[PDB]
Amino acid sequence: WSDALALGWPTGITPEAKLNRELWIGSVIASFAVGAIVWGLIFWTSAFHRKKATDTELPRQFGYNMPLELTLTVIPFLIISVLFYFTVVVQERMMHKDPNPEVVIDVTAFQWNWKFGYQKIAFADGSFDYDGADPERKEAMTSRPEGKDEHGIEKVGPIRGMTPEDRTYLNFDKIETLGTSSEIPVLVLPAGKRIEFVLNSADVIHGFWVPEFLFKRDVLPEPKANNSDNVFQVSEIQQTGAFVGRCTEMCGTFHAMMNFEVRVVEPNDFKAYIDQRNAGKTNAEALAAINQPPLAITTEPFESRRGELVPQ
Amino acid sequence: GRPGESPFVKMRPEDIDAGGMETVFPWRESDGDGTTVESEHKLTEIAMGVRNPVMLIRIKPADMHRVIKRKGQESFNFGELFAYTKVCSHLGCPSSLYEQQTYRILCPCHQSQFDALEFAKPIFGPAARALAQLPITIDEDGYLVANGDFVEPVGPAFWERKS
Amino acid sequence: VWLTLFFDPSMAHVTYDGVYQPLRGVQMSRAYETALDISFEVRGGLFVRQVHHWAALMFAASIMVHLARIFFTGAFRRPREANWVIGSLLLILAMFEGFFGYSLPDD
Amino acid sequence: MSSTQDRSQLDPEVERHTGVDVEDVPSAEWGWSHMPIGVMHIGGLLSAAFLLVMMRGNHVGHVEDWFLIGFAAVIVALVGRNWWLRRRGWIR
Amino acid sequence: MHIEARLFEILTAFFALAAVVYAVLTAMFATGGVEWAGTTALVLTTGLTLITGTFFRFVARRLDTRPEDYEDAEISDGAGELGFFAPHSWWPILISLSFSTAAVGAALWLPWLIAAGVAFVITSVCGLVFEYYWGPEKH
Amino acid sequence: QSALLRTGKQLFETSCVSCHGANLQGVPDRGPSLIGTGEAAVYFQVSTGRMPAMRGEAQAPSKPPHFDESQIDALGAYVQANGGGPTVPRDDHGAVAQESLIGGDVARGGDLFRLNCASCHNFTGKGGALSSGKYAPDLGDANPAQIYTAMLTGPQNMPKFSDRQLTPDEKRDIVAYVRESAETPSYGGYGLGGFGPAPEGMAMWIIGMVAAIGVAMWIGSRA
Amino acid sequence: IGAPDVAFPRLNALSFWLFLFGALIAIAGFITPGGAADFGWTAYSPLTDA
Amino acid sequence: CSAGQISQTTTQEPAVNGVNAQAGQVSLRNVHLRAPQQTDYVEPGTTVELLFVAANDSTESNKLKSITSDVGEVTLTGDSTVPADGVLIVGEPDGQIQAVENAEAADAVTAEVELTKPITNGLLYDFTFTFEDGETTVAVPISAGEQPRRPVPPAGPG
Amino acid sequence: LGLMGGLLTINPIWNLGPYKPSQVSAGSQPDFYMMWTDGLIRLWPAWEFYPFGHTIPQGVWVAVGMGLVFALLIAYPFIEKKVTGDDAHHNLLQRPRDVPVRTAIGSMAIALYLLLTFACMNDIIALKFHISLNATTWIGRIGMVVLPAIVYFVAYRWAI
């Protein structure tokens, strides 16, 4: 009954997702109760037809019921305040910002596909002496001694002294699971660990949404400069297997072709995968080596052809 | 575009590259450079010939399979080199606007497109007759030469035509 | 009249060898060469030819506006159909003379 | 009140007795005021026919032909509606 | 115009409260301090309502109760010379067309068309404004 | 250069692998293969900003560059290393040569431009319309290096003018003519764009004829 | 409200024509070869940049 | 609807001399012949290079590149099994950057052909590239990568 | 006219090289008074007939069109009087509103002329106002039979 009453909400795979699903179930129950009573009122006042027995006498013509108005403007405030309190307590576990993530994934989303960096890994049980690279974060300070003019301008740069073509906000890592247009990226994560996602956009705003995480975030170009808390954490992922993930903000024309996967594997599988990726290998090769289907099993890199009626 | 001296210089297939167009003219060894006075009148005549200018276009090897050839013009092309008269088949303006990756020779005077891939037949605009295709080949030394003459009158059409 | 005092109609090929640097040593008709001479070499020749061409455009435009006036107001009826006819011939002549005029400097 | 009422004697010459009336066109007597509806019907039919005939030509695309068909169908539908309504006495 | 002014006074009070609370709770408890977009927008919509309500209050204090604003007012009380309301005019469509020309000139970055559209807008606004003041031709 | 290639690959990975795979092979029906296009093509396209294109249409429009000069050089070096092809001209220091591309002769450049370029652009470098949704952009914005690389590579529907077809001297002359025609003030008043008949007729009908008709309305009477 | 007309009745005529012609030029992006505005109705910032 | 399914920009070949042959798992890019010719033909018995780039499409690999020989006896010096979700650059196309400038497996799989038959620029010559997956005829062209014009003799008017 | 000759540049031939059969430009328009003939050339749909061993190119279509245009323009007053019956000596003008059918016909003709002129300019219109060149050509082709009808109807009703 819960699945049907959830209105097609996938059963979460994280503690945060489970808690959000429970809040959604409660809020939908409240909304359906309110809707049921209001629709009952409407379909019961629809029983007040103009009865032919109604002689030349108009209705009670009352209007203006102050006590009833007060009651029906007090109760909605109570309902929405209870819902707001539940919302706040659930929100509190939206980004706990635990300063000790078990694996940090640098999710950089460029125009029409994804890339995952594996910035850092630090298992609580003790493992994964791994770290991000960051030699490639090179700035584009246009601080030339002189510009077109002969002297004086000594232009530094448009924005904070730099150029919009900066890309310094982007972070890069040794293990990059770049997603090609013909190969859906598959970010592989260890099961049972705390996974942080550091979110960024190379070109334009778009949205990282794993539907089974019951949570999305908007990867913006420069979240730090836009006062956006791009980085967000997930306490745990219980269920293993492949979970589809999608782009949920306008990217451009190929906004519907940015699907990726978040394949949750066991911690030992993650050990093997990261070792085999440190060794020169691709994501598909590492998946095959850890004995898991290499290509995204929940989605395909569907046709680059503009459509069905195009003549190939 | 050299001002006056050696205005027309022999040409080689290697000079053009896939998806390239070059306006060529009918130059003869006798019509040497413009240094002399006997020359520079032959050269002026070549330049001012209404039906003289031709466009040599290099069809991409990948797109060579989309080419459809005309009757009596199947062997006119030298490999992937196609020579079509620049004079538009409709009122005779040059059709110089060559579009590659579409292979459409557009005329600016009245916006008529000719499909270069197929024999240069008009696929839009006032034109109704295809551009005349010059037979081309390479002579000794590899220079491009015409392998004949147009099998049809090349300028714009007129009453005494198509017979 | 001023323009004809400086214009030479001919296709006789000549290299410019004038003042206009962007066209030097280029074969051109004497008509184009003398149009360039009017534009550059002659004091106020550019202005005279520009006002001539603008007068041609205004001549055509005002003929069109006058034709619209008379047609819409019915000034062509019984007494003046001949006037309408000769005015139409005048409009045709103006059109073709403007054609020949901006065709005169071989461009 | 700084205006003087105008009066005019316009030389008249059809006697505007079979055609349009002042009720329909207030200034019928002052100038050419009615074109036979047959002229408009035949003109619309010929315009639609010309639009259809323009499909035959040198153009590989067919968006142009579909636009021609749509406009010709609109013209034919308008002419048919007008003709039918007039035949039935401007009914429906 | 007491109620007319009081509407905007209430709106101004609410918007001032909203701007103040937003500014405070964004200067603290936000990622980067004051948002500076919502804050400014709220402050200047408070200013919108404040200007309108202040003018309406000035008018209400300057005006004796109108029949419109007076409960228990008979129709004959307000009966009288209503002011000039513009009859038919074709200048609005010309103004709209001129502004559309300027707008397309801005969209398609055509400075010549922008200039033409601005000149047409000036002409059409002049026509609309002078429509009922142009005197008779003096010959 | 090693670091230049690394930077170019880095930018390529997060810019355009959605349209030409990490191997630079063209993604079928989204973008053409970059193998052999060359540093010159990459420079022209990215510097003009045309290429990081966010739609498939009749013609990819020009737009503000999405990469600075150093990043453009990184992209070009990466693509040259992967495919190998034409290289953008450069001066003695190493920067992309622009002044050096201004050919000495301008009459020759103008003749070449008219024979080859004006065909679709204009007499004086303005734009021109093409078959269906395409167009030739106005050259006034293109700097000499961009003009030279635009000749060297055929971006889209522009014939590819190889160095053999137009030797660097002829290309430099064409660049000089383009810059001269773009930066030359219009002699004889405001130059209405560059198109003569259409702008001139519009200007007549608006300025001259509105002036004449308004003056006629002023002088005469209404009745 | 019992009024005969609106406060500025030539202004509301302008408002309708500003609506009509303003609307037409927005929908007119379709006739262009590229198409109408591809970005969403919300038209978020970087996607709408040149 | 000029931005529909059939769009000019999307349906464009690269503006490069080499042809593209996507047939087979491995896609061939910028496949041309460097055969500098001083006369009508490149005479038989002269070795000319076969440039191209073999890009692997499927990461699951087709790195064999068995023979890729046709009329011309194409030999693959320094052959290697490079293509695995990557590129195999057989030679050094004119303007190619020496990304390494060192002997990495000697030459990078340079393909050279002893013609045994005249060829000339502007013609298309069939080459059968055969990987373990399959074989494809490519119809390679002749490309003068970065060579300038060869001075044509001055003309003596007659 | 002097102010225009000063401030506005008209036909800057120096930018336009000397005529050569090979050199071209994208604009290629005549003055506005011949722009309508050029637009007729552009719009008329490439209909050529081939009698026994001969050709009748698309140019003759426009030649006949111009002939018809001039003939009708010259012979309108006589056409007008044949149609209406007016053989009276008219010295008082008619207001265009007072003569609807003639006003409608004149509006229709002006609409056709403007459509032809903008069709001739379709190259620059397509270039600047981002419309496909084929789209402008076919807009002209369809509108040269649609826009005249729309303008006739609108002008007739407007006069009434």
Ligand SMILES: CC(C)=CCC/C(C)=C/CC/C(C)=C/CC/C(C)=C/CC/C(C)=C/CC/C(C)=C/CC/C(C)=C/CC/C(C)=C/CC/C(C)=C/CC1=C(C)C(=O)c2ccccc2C1=O
């Ligand atoms: C044969 C034919 C007419 C084919 C169709 C091509 C065509 C003309 C399409 C319309 C052009 C337009 C209006 C494009 C904008 C986008 C569009 C279609 C919007 C919807 C149209 C619509 C119903 C809008 C509602 C409000 C409305 C009426 C807006 C009109 C806006 C405009 C542009 C008004 C002015 C009309 C106008 C000037 C159109 C261009 C015509 C010409 C020949 C301009 C000539 C000209 C040019 C081309 C210059 O470059 C130039 C440069 C420097 C100085 C002068 C000029 C100059 O005069």
Ligand SMILES: CCCCCCCCCCCCCCCC(=O)O[C@H](COC(=O)CCCCCCC[C@@H](C)CCCCCCCCC)COP(=O)(O)O[C@H]1[C@H](O)[C@H](O)[C@H](O)[C@@H](O)[C@@H]1O
């Ligand atoms: C007063 C003059 C105004 C004109 C009056 C006439 C009104 C009648 C309008 C008739 C409309 C007819 C439109 C059809 C036209 C047509 O047939 O062409 C198409 C393009 O469709 C279009 O957008 C058409 C949009 C039509 C819009 C109508 C515009 C009305 C405006 C002009 C009115 C405002 C007037 C303002 C006057 C200003 C005052 C003046 C003083 C396809 O081109 P193409 O590009 O090649 O498409 C390829 C595919 O085919 C192929 O599949 C695929 O492969 C692709 O490759 C693709 O390219």
Ligand SMILES: CCCCCCCCCCCCCCCC(=O)O[C@H](COC(=O)CCCCCCC[C@@H](C)CCCCCCCCC)COP(=O)(O)O[C@H]1[C@H](O)[C@H](O)[C@H](O)[C@@H](O)[C@@H]1O
């Ligand atoms: C009684 C006669 C009164 C006539 C008024 C005369 C106007 C005086 C204008 C100013 C003085 C003379 C300027 C001469 C120097 C000069 O030419 O002026 C250009 C500017 O040009 C533009 O942009 C246009 C700027 C907009 C203002 C001018 C618009 C006036 C129009 C509206 C008058 C005609 C009427 C038409 C009505 C239209 C409406 C129809 C309903 C400026 O350079 P630029 O801007 O960079 O030009 C680019 C090259 O650089 C680059 O290569 C090149 O490739 C191009 O991109 C070029 O634009």
Ligand SMILES: CCCCCCCC/C=C\CCCCCCCC(=O)OC[C@H](COP(=O)(O)OCCN)OC(=O)CCCCCCCCCCCCCCC
């Ligand atoms: C309301 C319902 C309107 C209809 C709603 C559906 C609209 C869908 C339109 C485009 C979708 C994108 C596909 C874009 C590709 C086109 C489809 C295709 O694949 O067909 C190929 C040819 C070119 O291919 P070709 O090789 O060069 O030539 C082939 C050689 N034999 O196009 C064609 O047939 C053109 C056929 C496309 C349909 C026509 C669209 C214009 C309709 C205008 C209606 C206006 C009515 C006016 C009313 C006043």
Ligand code: HEC
């Ligand atoms: C149609 C044939 C054609 C001819 C021939 C041609 N062009 Fe172009 N040109 C184009 C087209 C189409 C584009 C658009 C390319 C793009 O947007 O990627 C273009 C783009 C350009 C640009 C880019 C301008 C900018 O700001 O982005 C320049 C510069 C240029 N051409 C100059 C030249 C020069 C120099 C020649 C010397 C002969 C020439 N063209 C010949 C059609 C042509």
Ligand code: HEC
């Ligand atoms: C699908 C969107 C798209 C993206 C994003 C894109 N390209 Fe392209 N690319 C194309 C298309 C389509 C063409 C051919 C048409 C054109 O260039 O307008 C092309 C052509 C090119 C060319 C010219 C090819 C030739 O033969 O002249 C170069 C160089 C190029 N791309 C490099 C790049 C670089 C570098 C980037 C990243 C900065 C990039 N592209 C991003 C689609 C794209």
Ligand SMILES: *C[C@@H](COC(=O)CCCCCCCCCCCCCCC)OC(=O)CCCCCCCC[C@@H](C)CCCCCCCC
């Ligand atoms: C790609 C295909 C598929 O789409 C279609 O077929 C839909 C086409 C709908 C019909 C459009 C007809 C053109 C508008 C005619 C308006 C009347 C003109 C006469 C009066 C001057 O189709 C296409 O090729 C392109 C599809 C996009 C078409 C966009 C049309 C946008 C209309 C815009 C120019 C404004 C119209 C002005 C209406 C004026 C009437 C109110 C005053």
Ligand SMILES: *C(=O)CCCCCCCCCCCCCCC
């Ligand atoms: C061409 O490049 C653009 C194609 C746009 C595809 C979507 C079709 C939109 C049609 C909606 C109706 C247009 C307005 C109708 C006015 C009568």
Ligand code: FES
């Ligand atoms: S002059 Fe070339 S199509 Fe008409």
Ligand SMILES: [Cu+2]
């Ligand atoms: Cu998305």
Ligand SMILES: [Cu+2]
């Ligand atoms: Cu995205």
